[PDB]
Design a protein around this nucleic acid. Sequence first.
DNA 1: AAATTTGTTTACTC
DNA 2: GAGTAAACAAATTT
Length: 90
Amino acid sequence: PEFFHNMDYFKYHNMRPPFTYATLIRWAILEAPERQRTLNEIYHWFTRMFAYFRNHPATWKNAIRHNLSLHKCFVRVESEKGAVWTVDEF
DNA sequence: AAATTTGTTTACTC
DNA sequence: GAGTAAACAAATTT
């Protein structure tokens, strides 16, 4: 099922986070010191920070792409080393 | 080329 | 409204 209680950031049990994909990406973007991540680093952040997303990569990687291009608060920026994703706080 | 991750789109269960 | 599902074009790497 989903989270049993009010536990904070324990990623060590394969339990679904109680948060939307839109918000999880937004936190992932703002964790980086430069406030942007590539799509691949977003994938690394998700697997690293949650045990649940370590089992069925295809199902949720599709969601991650779907949310990025559907919300106007996610912006793609070309960089020197490749495309990155930022967040509009407004 | 051709392979394949990387991005936009409309519509189904729940 | 979100979580999936698929379908398809665009970047980006073989």
